[PDB]
């Protein structure tokens, strides 16, 4: 049931977003991530996330809901091949997401494994 | 405006809860915390939190809202003296909170400073 592992890794992505703790991303994002057709190092992609996060300059208790980033009822998980899953979800535009240039209403996330153990985010679009 | 520092520290407490990342608690909880009239070491209190968290054995995408732990509209912050603030908030009973023995519907959190720089959680009841 790798579908549940992908839901866990997506959950970890979302929990990192809402908690603004970007150290949880290091176990979720691959060493290279294709962000809108362009490859970026894990660290450059994570620093995009934190930098955009701080750009929003929102209330300390604002946007502490997954509901503020995603319509979880829209969530779809689909095995694309042996080493690849596609997550499709409807995402929302908030004062933080508007700062993320890769952020789309119709979001595609690819999770890829290279050791058949660890499923990391390798593409976001 | 220390009121905003306390709201930030409470926010950090809440973000740790929702994210299930208990490493963010190490900057929020004091070395000793009075849990329901009894003092506990920071680590013993944090291990109560994570252990209870895992007892709930909930869906990966369940309880990713501050709304699931607290009525933020109930939140009240009140300076008690020079080194002490009281946070009062109405908390909710979920499949995780029911595992926390100290968890009450009417929650009192005391934030104390010993260096007039850092406000840590020193009591929960």
* Phi, psi (degrees; rounded to nearest 5) at B18: -70, -45
Resolution, angstroms, 1 dp: 2.1
Task: Find the farthest-apart pair of alpha carbons in chain A and give their distance in angstroms, rounded.
Answer: 43
Total number of domains in chain B: 1
Strands A38-41 and B38-41: unpaired
Task: List the CATH number of the domain containing B59.
Answer: 3.10.450
**Segment A78-85 long-range contacts (CB within 8 Å, at least 24 positions apart):** A79/A2, A79/A3, A80/A110, A83/A112, A83/A113, A83/A114, A83/A116, A84/A110, A84/A111, A84/A112, A85/A2, A85/A3, A85/A6, A85/A110, A85/A111, A85/A119
Please give the backbone phi and psi of residue B9, each rounded to the nearest 5 degrees, phi first. -65, -40
Method: X-ray
Q: Look up the domain containing B29 and give its range.
A: 2-124
**What token pair was written down for A23?**
């150290």
Cβ(A14)–Cβ(A96) under 8 Å? no
Q: Does A8 touch chain B (CB under 8 A)?
A: yes
B5 touches chain A (CB under 8 A): no
Q: Which bin fits B121, alpha (ψ -120 to 50), beta or left (φ > 0)?
A: beta
CB of A58 less than 8 A from some CB of B: no
């Amino acid at each position: 049931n790798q579908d549940k592992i992908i839901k866990f890794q997506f959950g970890k992505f979302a929990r990192a977003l809402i908690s603004r703790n970007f150290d949880l991303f290091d176990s979720v994002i691959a060493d290279k991530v294709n962000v809108m057709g362009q490859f970026e190092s894990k660290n450059d992609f994570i620093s995009t996330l934190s930098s955009a996060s701080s750009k929003a300059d929102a209330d300390e208790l604002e946007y502490l809901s997954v509901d503020d980033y995603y319509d979880l009822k829209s969530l779809k998980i689909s095995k694309s091949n042996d080493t690849s899953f596609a997550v499709n979800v409807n995402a929302k535009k908030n004062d933080v997401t508007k700062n993320f240039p890769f952020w789309k209403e119709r979001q595609t996330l690819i999770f890829t494994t290279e050791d058949d153990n660890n499923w990391f985010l390798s593409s976001i679009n």
